[PDB]
């Protein structure tokens, strides 16, 4: 069972990677109010720019 000692630095690396993903995911969501959308194209950009007017001017 001594070989579990080796599994600790590997588990720490895996946790480091999980932090690198999740921490940046939750900060973007807090700043924008919704999760980051994969594949933001020209249409989505134009929809956001139009939605700004349709919301604020309402």
């Amino acid at each position: 069972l001594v070989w579990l000692e080796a599994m600790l630095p590997l588990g720490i690396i895996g946790g480091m990677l999980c932090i690198m993903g999740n921490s940046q995911y939750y900060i973007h969501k807090a700043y924008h109010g919704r999760p980051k959308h994969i594949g933001h194209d020209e249409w989505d950009v134009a929809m956001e720019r139009r939605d700004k007017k349709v919301v604020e001017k309402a």
């Binding site: 000692e5 690396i13 990677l17 900060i27």
Partner: protein, 324 residues
């Protein structure tokens, strides 16, 4: 854009910790294979050994030999370290968990790979030592040689996906992981990653006993540390690409509700950890090639196979109209 630095730091700092602990895990797994214990005195189970080595390294006096290339000598490790760090901006860890959702992210990764040679070349030349220069030239040649195969394998994956977006590449593996039909391509990709990171059995800079002085022989203190950290950060990245391209990234092994209970970042981490174990397992298993042997392998074995696999995959998909 004000919270962008928080995201960048939440990527960079844990990456530097993960690299510190990759060095430890490499020393532990090699030790256990060799019936030894490995670092277990400095901290409980040796878990403070990375901190001790880093602090020791920053407390070491810099040397800075009397060369006419004072600036380039210090800049080369910065260059390689920066290149190793900046590739992670486009790496997706889970659906939506990525700093930059580049539509050209595949070509961007290839470009960073291509830039990686300059740190080694410049370190070798600026050292004013013919041994360092010759070792550097050989390492640069090996890296560019295996970049050809890496790029042709990237083309195979791109043909299957039809998009350079890394998240799209992952999500195209929902039906089946690409490492199942393209298992030989995965094997050749893992070997080409070993040769691109200068890792065993291709680690020429480690073969000092073999009368081969590495490009970083003259470096001390933190410049030497930056070279080492860039190299190890590249190994985690190459394990992440093996995961993204062929093991379906953050996706679960089976599309079942029991497997979808654990999040995608855990799946991605576990696959990355499998590949990092194999990098260490290979170092622990085999001797190393000579320079001429691995150069012959690069040009005469991996270029032809990679090219043939591009032709075969594109032809099969065009024939039966299975293209994306």
């Amino acid at each position: 854009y004000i919270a962008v630095p928080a995201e960048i730091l939440g990527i960079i700092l844990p990456l530097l910790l993960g690299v510190a602990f990759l060095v430890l895990a490499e020393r532990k797994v090699m030790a256990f294979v060799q019936r030894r214990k490995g670092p277990d005195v400095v901290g409980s189970f040796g878990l403070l050994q990375p901190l001790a080595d880093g602090l020791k390294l920053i407390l070491k006096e810099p040397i800075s030999p009397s060369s006419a290339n004072f600036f380039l000598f210090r800049m080369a490790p910065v260059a390689t370290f920066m290149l190793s760090l900046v590739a992670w901006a486009v790496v997706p860890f889970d659906y939506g968990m990525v700093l930059s959702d580049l539509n050209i992210g595949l070509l961007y990764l290839f470009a960073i790979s291509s830039l990686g040679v300059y740190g080694i070349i410049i370190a070798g030349r600026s050292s004013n030592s013919k041994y360092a220069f010759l070792g550097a030239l050989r390492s640069a040649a090996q890296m560019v040689s295996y970049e050809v195969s890496i790029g042709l394998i990237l083309i195979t994956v791109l043909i299957c996906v039809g998009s350079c977006n890394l998240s799209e590449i992952v999500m195209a593996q929902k039906q089946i992981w690409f490492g199942i039909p393209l298992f030989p391509v995965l094997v050749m990709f893992f070997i080409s990653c070993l040769a691109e990171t200068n890792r065993a059995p291709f680690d020429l800079p480690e073969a000092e006993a073999e009368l081969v002085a590495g490009y970083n022989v003259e470096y001390s203190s933190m410049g030497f540390a930056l070279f080492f950290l860039g190299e190890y950060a590249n190994m985690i990245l190459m394990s992440g690409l093996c995961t993204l391209f062929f093991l379906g990234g953050w996706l679960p092994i089976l599309d079942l509700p029991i497997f979808k209970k654990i999040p995608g970042s855990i799946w991605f981490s576990i696959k990355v950890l499998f590949f990092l174990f194999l990098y260490i397992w290979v170092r622990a298993a085999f001797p190393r090639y000579r320079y001429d042997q691995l150069m012959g392998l690069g040009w005469k074995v991996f270029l032809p196979l990679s090219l043939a696999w591009v032709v075969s995959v594109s032809g099969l998909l065009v024939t039966f109209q299975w293209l994306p």
